[PDB]
């Protein structure tokens, strides 16, 4: 943004803006394959609490 | 409904109501209004026959942005998370470093007489300041051509150093002076590395350059066993022979590696010596020697506020430190490459940068129904900041009515603002956090 | 930061010679012009001539028989002598560094303290 | 963990030329606030279970 | 400055250390310092120049 | 061979209001004009070096402009310190030439 | 912007040797048109505002 | 080190504990198997058959 005038800035900020939401989208996915094995964990232990 | 659409394009700033009078003249009870438009988000809802019969207005106290967020018109109960917040910046540091010379830049440009292209000569240009604004905008060179930084924007940059190199071009080798050219001049007389970072410029100088009779002063290197490294410089002059072993001229296959030239004065436009200068820019990370004009000021710690030290910009909150530089080292990173700290430039202190507040806000409410108040808590943050950014219209979202009463509370999730403490304790209704507990009850 | 300082005499018989002499400091000659300027009373400023290393000299259009400029690399000093010397030619006389920008003519941005001389 | 995430200052940070941009995109990263949210409370309605 | 010349019967007290690189033209030079008292050995160590 | 004149011979202001002075040339010029600030007694000073440039260490509040043949030097907020004489000089051509200079009256 | 921009060269009517001097435009304003704009006004002009 | 000077290096391609040590980001290994990278045979000649 400093040493780029905005109509060359952009092209670059569109590549940068598809790689970062590439890597959000990866991150939470996984987080939500990891969420169902710890819930089955739980609900065990409170079987095992009961 | 909207009756016109009128042409008219001009600029209106003021009006005037026209009334009528009558008779000696006298006036008649009449009343009329005015007020004023402002750019605003609406909801609107549209009935069976097409026909529009309520709004709300997003900006109009928290329960409208949960209206619009959740698109209703009722709410039943909870917490609801509706955007994150900020603080605006405040004001603006500038601290280049002190230097009083002026860049000497014509004693390279207005020379009398230029090298020979396969010996060009380098020179440093260092502690002074310049405008680049000049040669932008003037007609005097043929060609322009800047890589990695656009040349609009010189005079914002500041350069530990300058490197001027300068030699003769014969007709259209111009197209040679670029990365990655190939050729007898790209290999052999000159060469450019592949991440080069500077400017190129060119200009036509038959009028001294040449004659009738023709100037033959000026040689190039055709004939070498291999190319050149990126700004390597050969000067050597000894007689070749393709074999790779020494000879002696008139004796067979024995030659001089570099050929004399000359121009003449009805070269045709391909044909014309030109002069050519490659500026290139060292953006080494130390104490920066030339710079742009730019008037400083003091600086403004423990504010939230715009700073650019020295080419690098952003916001923050500027802070002493306890930070030890070397003597060679002016900047200090962070994973993911973040600018932690800073020398001075001025007095060499060490200071630090941090980022201003920011966080989400989430609105508790009882249901719609039973009645229309809110609480709304702030996440993560100390009161004193977001009380003295609410104050003087620092913070965003900026509702048009609100008010911070007397009832602030400070809890370990943020604090909230409009909720009433009580010493007792009851089941939990809506969980808020770290223990803290909110319902809808009686005084 | 320099310091330019010059010394000479006061006083010139008409018909005489006049020659001034200037001397650096806090560092030596190197890179830069070196410039002659001379004030006559009351009136606006004049332009003798500029000398720079490696002797190369320019001096004005006109009184170029009037005066020679010389410099010298060694004890950081520069002169000028002049070859007739009239009470016209009173004035107060400045040595002044020259810096170059871009093309044309350099401006004088250092001025020495001057000295005032004159004829009787 | 219970983690959560701001959009704009990951993808955007301060600069406001690159949010006019990601503004293209819609809702997308808010449905993905909406999801993390959810991980959120499941993991204290699984303690408050066992 | 000053340096000196001189003779001494001892083994050498010092021990000096540089690196050489060529690149784009640019030669780089780096410097460090050990004291040492050692007979013709190099001796085992970590220094960072 | 350019040559020079200034307008007026003469000024005078009392502080707090803005004045302008204005120099002349025979023929084009571009950006080729400085600035100079003479006190009675003292070497001149560089004030402006480009055609709307300060330098460094100038106040602030000085600023000029023009172009072609026609420049004028605004002096705004004066104080009694700037009481000077002003000067103008174009070194585009070889031969140099300063102008006639404005006295400015307290 | 949405339609169709057209030109053509009138030298044979819109010149002539002495030349025809009937055309004017304004290079002088404290402020930028908006779009489609218009001002027809002539006035004495003076940088100071006055 | 916390002043800012290094005091210590490994070097990834001696003997294959260097990039165990290299691909862990550690000083330090516990136990079991690692894997690196892959492995393959460069070609020894080259065969034209016009
Ligand atoms: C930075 O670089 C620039 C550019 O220089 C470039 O590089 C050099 C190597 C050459 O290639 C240049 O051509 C090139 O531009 C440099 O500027 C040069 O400085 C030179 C001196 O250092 C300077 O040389 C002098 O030029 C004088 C001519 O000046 C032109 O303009 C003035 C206007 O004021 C006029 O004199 C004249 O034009 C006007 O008047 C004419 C009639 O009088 C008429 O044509 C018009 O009315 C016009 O208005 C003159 O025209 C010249 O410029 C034209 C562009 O406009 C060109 O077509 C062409 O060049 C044309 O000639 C000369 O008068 C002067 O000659 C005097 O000294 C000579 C050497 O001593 C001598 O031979 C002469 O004759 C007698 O004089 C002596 C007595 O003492 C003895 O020598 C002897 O007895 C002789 O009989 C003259 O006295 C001299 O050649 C050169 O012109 C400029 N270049 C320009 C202006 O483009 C900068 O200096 C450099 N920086 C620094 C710090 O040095
Ligand atoms: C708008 O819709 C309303 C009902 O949603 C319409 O009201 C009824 O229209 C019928 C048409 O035959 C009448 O017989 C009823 O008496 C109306 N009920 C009322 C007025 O309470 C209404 O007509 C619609 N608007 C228009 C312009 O037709
Ligand atoms: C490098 O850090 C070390 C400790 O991590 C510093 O050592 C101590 O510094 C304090 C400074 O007040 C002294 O009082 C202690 O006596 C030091 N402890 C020692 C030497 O064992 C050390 O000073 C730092 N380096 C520099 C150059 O300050
Ligand atoms: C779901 C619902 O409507 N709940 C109550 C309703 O029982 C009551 O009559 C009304 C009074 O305003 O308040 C609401
Ligand atoms: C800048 O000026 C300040 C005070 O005027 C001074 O302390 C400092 O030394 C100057 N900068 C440099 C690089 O000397
Ligand atoms: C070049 O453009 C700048 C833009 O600010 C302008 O001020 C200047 O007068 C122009 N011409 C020059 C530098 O010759």
Request: hydrophobic share 35%; with cysteine; net charge neutral.
């Amino acid at each position: 943004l400093s040493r780029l005038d905005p109509p060359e800035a952009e092209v670059q900020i569109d590549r940068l803006i598809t790689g970062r939401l590439q890597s959000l989208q990866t991150y939470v996915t996984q987080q939500l394959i990891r969420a169902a094995e710890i819930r089955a964990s739980a609900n065990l232990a409170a079987t095992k609490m009961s | 409904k909207p009756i016109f659409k009128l042409p008219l394009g001009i600029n209106i700033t003021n009006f005037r109501a026209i009334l009528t009078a009558f008779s000696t003249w006298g006036t008649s009870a009449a009343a009329y209004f005015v007020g004023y438009l402002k750019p605003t988000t609406f909801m609107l809802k549209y009935d069976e026959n097409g026909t529009i019969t309520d709004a709300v207005d997003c900006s109009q106290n928290p329960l409208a942005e949960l209206k619009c967020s959740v698109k209703s018109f009722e709410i039943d109960k909870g917490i609801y998370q509706t955007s994150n917040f900020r603080v605006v910046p405040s004001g603006d540091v500038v601290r280049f470093p002190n230097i009083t010379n002026l860049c000497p830049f014509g004693e390279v440009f207005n020379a009398t007489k230029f090298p020979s292209v396969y010996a060009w000569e380098r020179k440093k240009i260092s502690n002074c300041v310049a405008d680049y604004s000049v040669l932008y905008n003037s007609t005097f060179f043929s060609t322009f051509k800047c890589y990695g930084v656009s040349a609009t924007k010189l005079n914002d940059l500041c350069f530990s150093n300058v490197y001027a190199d300068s030699f003769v071009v014969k007709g259209d080798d111009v197209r040679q002076i670029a990365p990655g050219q190939t050729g007898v001049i790209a290999d052999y007389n000159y060469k450019l590395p592949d991440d080069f970072m500077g400017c190129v410029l060119a200009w036509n100088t038959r009028n001294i350059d040449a004659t009738s009779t023709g100037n033959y002063n000026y040689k190039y290197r055709y004939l070498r066993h291999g190319k050149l490294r990126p700004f390597e410089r050969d000067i050597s002059n000894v007689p070749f022979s393709p074999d790779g072993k020494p000879c002696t001229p008139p004796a067979l296959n024995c030659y001089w590696p570099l050929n004399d030239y000359g121009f003449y004065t009805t070269t045709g436009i391909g044909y014309q010596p030109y002069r050519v200068v490659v500026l290139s820019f060292e953006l080494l990370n130390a104490p920066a020697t030339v710079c742009g004009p730019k008037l400083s000021t003091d600086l403004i710690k423990n504010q939230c506020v715009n700073f650019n030290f020295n080419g690098l910009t952003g916001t923050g909150v500027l802070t002493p430190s306890s930070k030890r530089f070397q003597p060679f080292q002016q900047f200090g990173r962070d994973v993911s490459d973040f600018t932690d700290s800073v020398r001075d430039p001025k007095t060499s202190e060490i200071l630090d940068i941090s980022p201003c507040s920011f966080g989400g806000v989430s609105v508790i409410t009882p249901g719609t129904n039973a009645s229309s108040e809110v609480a709304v808590l702030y996440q993560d943050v100390n009161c004193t900041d977001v009380s003295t950014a609410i104050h003087a219209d620092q913070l965003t979202p900026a509702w048009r009515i609100y008010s911070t009463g007397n009832n602030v509370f400070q809890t370990q999730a943020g604090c909230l603002i409009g909720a009433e403490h009580v010493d007792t304790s009851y089941e939990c209704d809506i969980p808020i956090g770290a223990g803290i507990c909110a319902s809808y009850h009686t005084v | 930061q320099v310091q330019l300082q010059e010394s000479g005499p006061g006083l010139v018989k008409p018909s005489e010679t006049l020659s001034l002499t200037c001397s650096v400091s806090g560092g030596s000659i190197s890179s830069h012009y070196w410039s002659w300027i001379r004030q006559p009373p009351g009136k606006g400023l004049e332009w003798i001539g500029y000398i720079y290393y490696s002797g190369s000299t320019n001096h004005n259009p006109s009184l170029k028989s009037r005066v020679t400029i010389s410099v010298d690399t060694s004890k950081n000093q520069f002169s000028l002598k002049l070859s007739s010397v009239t009470a016209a030619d009173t004035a107060v006389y400045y040595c002044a560094r020259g810096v170059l920008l871009w093309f044309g003519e350099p401006i004088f941005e250092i001025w020495g303290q001057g000295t005032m001389v004159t004829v009787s | 963990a219970k983690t959560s995430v701001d959009c704009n200052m990951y993808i955007c940070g301060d600069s406001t030329e690159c949010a006019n941009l990601l503004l293209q995109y819609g809702s997308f990263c808010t449905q993905l606030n909406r999801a993390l949210s959810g991980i959120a409370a499941e993991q204290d309605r699984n303690t408050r279970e066992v | 400055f000053s340096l000196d010349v001189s003779e001494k019967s001892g083994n050498f007290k010092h021990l000096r250390e540089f690196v050489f690189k060529n690149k784009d033209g640019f030669l780089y030079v780096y410097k460090g310092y050990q004291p040492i008292d050692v007979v013709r050995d190099l001796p085992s160590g970590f220094n960072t120049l | 061979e350019i040559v020079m004149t200034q307008s007026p011979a003469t000024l005078s202001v009392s502080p707090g209001e803005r004045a302008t002075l204005s120099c002349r040339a025979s023929q084009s010029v571009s950006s080729s004009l400085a600035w100079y600030q003479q006190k009675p007694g003292q070497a001149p000073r560089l004030l402006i070096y480009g055609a709307s440039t300060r330098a460094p260490g100038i106040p602030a509040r000085f600023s000029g402009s023009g172009s072609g043949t026609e420049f004028t030097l605004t002096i705004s907020s004066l104080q009694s310190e700037d009481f000077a004489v002003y000067y103008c000089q174009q070194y585009n051509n070889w031969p140099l030439t300063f102008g006639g200079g404005t006295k400015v009256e307290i």
